[PDB]
Symmetry: C3
Subunit: 177 residues, 3 copies
């Protein structure tokens, strides 16, 4: 009842460009009014599996994984994460949603959120300190969802045959209730 | 699982230089012997609202927000944070009765000793460093230095020191969120 | 919300090169299926107490502290941390599998390969002597050690030619997925 997560099942569970090109491990543990979050990401196939900017000049240095939730905190099909790999550990989940007062949605006109809607972290590819990636977590940015967690990954380095196999990052956010 | 926080009320609640020039969002959630802390800061007016080191050569690149607590973990008036915006959680605002004991939320004095007469130099473990960012951009870093029990005329203290190196040009001091934990007094 | 930790007792409790050359402060607090961890490290004697790369050219810029656990989550004598300074918040405990890093989330290296998944690892920036300009990289790796059911490996490394800087680290918070 306490923890909402992606099962630890080894099989791919996430779409960046293409169905099942990635495995997201996301654990949301409710500790009162804060959610303790833990995230890692492995790309298993497609253009981001093996980064080589020396050989592929058209390769982006960013992708975005979105978790979209309805008014009851149910994950929506339009999410990048496959609905079938998201459940409580061994139903309503508003206690796990990012607080709308703390993290307001952008009025249609604006598009500009407060800064507090966002968390930045440094994560690393292939367990090496010298393969940094910036993870940008943004709450309630997506307009056609009551709640959202957006995971933006970006990097600067001209990586040469580095697998997108990320280290683990911990963060917290204020819970809706 | 009791939580001690600044209400989420949009109104300013904090003094850097001047009454109500800033809005601190601080949430302290007690998970047993550790406090899970979450902090963001917006400057709403004054010299730090909009940073421009090209146009204002006299502008510091640091300020300090202090939360000072008495022996009972009550926030003191001398704190930078307005006492009226600080209480236990009961929605998206605070409980009615202003609180009586919060020692369970205070930074442990054994883990984070106050500086003995002999030395004003604390142990390093009294301090947490984090990188936060202005205006949701990775290229506007600010160093947040959180220090416990550094202030001498208080039983307990949380000191939030903000500093940066870049000659920012028209960047609003509107910070991203940072999570940390510390060992609780009880 | 049971907590497993090193007592806050001021006495040294850890071996980097030599018995009691360091004091590790590690607090593992169980919040359901995640462990909330808090760590600081002070070196009290030996070659790493005071870093000077101008005066000592043979000094490494890394050391590793290992916590090794058996199938019941009991800390083993072969650990760098002294067994006597590790208990619930002194008659040693009996089961702590609820505090161990999950074997499904953080698999041990198959015989074939010593190469773990990246998710077994957490990187953090910590600082010596409470100064932003004395960075140290802490690399936390789970279940890397082959002769233990469970392990937490704390690798410390740095680049700067520090001149008379004490290895007195700031505090770092992380979490990991619990075995149960
Ligand atoms: C974990 C970490 O901070 N590693 C950093 C490494 C260093 O190898 C290390 O910090 C030295 O101790 O430098 C970078 O690659 C760099 O210069 O672009 C950034 C990267 O984030
Ligand atoms: C999250 C993070 O580490 N951000 C860092 C960024 C980005 O990494 C870089 O803009 C992408 O290439 O670099 C800095 O702006 C810089 O170089 O001065 C410092 C800042 O702390
Ligand atoms: C990010 C942080 O907290 N500390 C960083 C400091 C300070 O930002 C700087 O000394 C104050 O201006 O800069 C470095 O030493 C650097 O540029 O090589 C890296 C170090 O990680």
């Amino acid at each position: 009842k306490l923890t909402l997560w992606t099962t630890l099942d080894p099989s791919p569970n996430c779409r960046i460009d293409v169905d099942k090109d990635s495995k997201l491990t996301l654990v949301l543990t409710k500790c009162g009014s804060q959610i303790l979050a833990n995230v890692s990401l492995l790309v298993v196939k497609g253009r981001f599996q093996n980064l080589n900017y020396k050989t592929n000049p058209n390769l982006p240095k960013t992708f975005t994984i979105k978790l979209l939730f309805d008014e009851n905190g149910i994950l929506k099909d339009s999410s990048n994460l496959d609905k079938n790999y998201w459940n409580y550990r061994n139903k309503n989940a508003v206690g796990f949603m990012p607080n709308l007062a703390a993290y307001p949605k952008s009025t249609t006109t604006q598009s500009k959120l407060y800064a507090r809607n966002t968390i930045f972290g440094n994560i690393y590819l292939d367990s090496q300190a010298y393969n940094p990636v910036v993870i940008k977590i943004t709450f309630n940015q997506e307009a056609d969802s009551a709640y959202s967690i957006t995971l933006n990954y970006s990097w600067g380095k001209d990586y040469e045959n580095i697998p997108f196999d990320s280290t683990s990052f911990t963060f917290s956010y204020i819970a809706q209730e």
